[PDB]
């Protein structure tokens, strides 16, 4: 499933925490979402739900394939620099280059402390 994705952040994310802070914060971290974030640590989710956006359209392995995010790929990394499985194929890299997105936007973004289990009648 989404369980390489924390193996993928460790790898990307000199500093930050993962999931355990990131995943319940700021406004907009389902699909599609959008008022804007609050912070752009939402709007690191923003890139990453929107690229698993275009996975439920993929033809590449296509949604019959119910959720491929895991069980078929694993990654590289290591500025940030995470990637994938390094022969990087057609759908192990492209759920592999939305869930890098992810891992070094965590690093890209000014971060939700704030959001961080968030209140949006405010943010959003
Ligand atoms: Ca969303």
Not at 60 to 78: A, G, H, Q, R
Not at 107 to 115: G, L, Q
């Amino acid at each position: 499933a989404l369980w390489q994705f924390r193996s993928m952040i460790k790898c990307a994310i000199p500093g930050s925490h993962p999931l355990m802070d990131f995943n319940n914060y700021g406004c907009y971290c389902g699909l599609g979402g959008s008022g804007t974030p609050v912070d752009e640590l939402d709007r690191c989710c923003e890139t990453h739900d929107n690229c698993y956006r275009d996975a439920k359209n993929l033809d590449s392995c296509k949604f019959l394939v119910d959720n491929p995010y895991t069980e078929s790929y694993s990654y590289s990394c290591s500025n940030t620099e995470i990637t994938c499985n390094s022969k990087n194929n057609a759908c192990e890299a492209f759920i592999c280059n939305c869930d890098r997105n992810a891992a070094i936007c965590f690093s890209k973004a000014p971060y939700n402390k704030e959001h961080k289990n968030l209140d949006t009648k405010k943010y959003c």
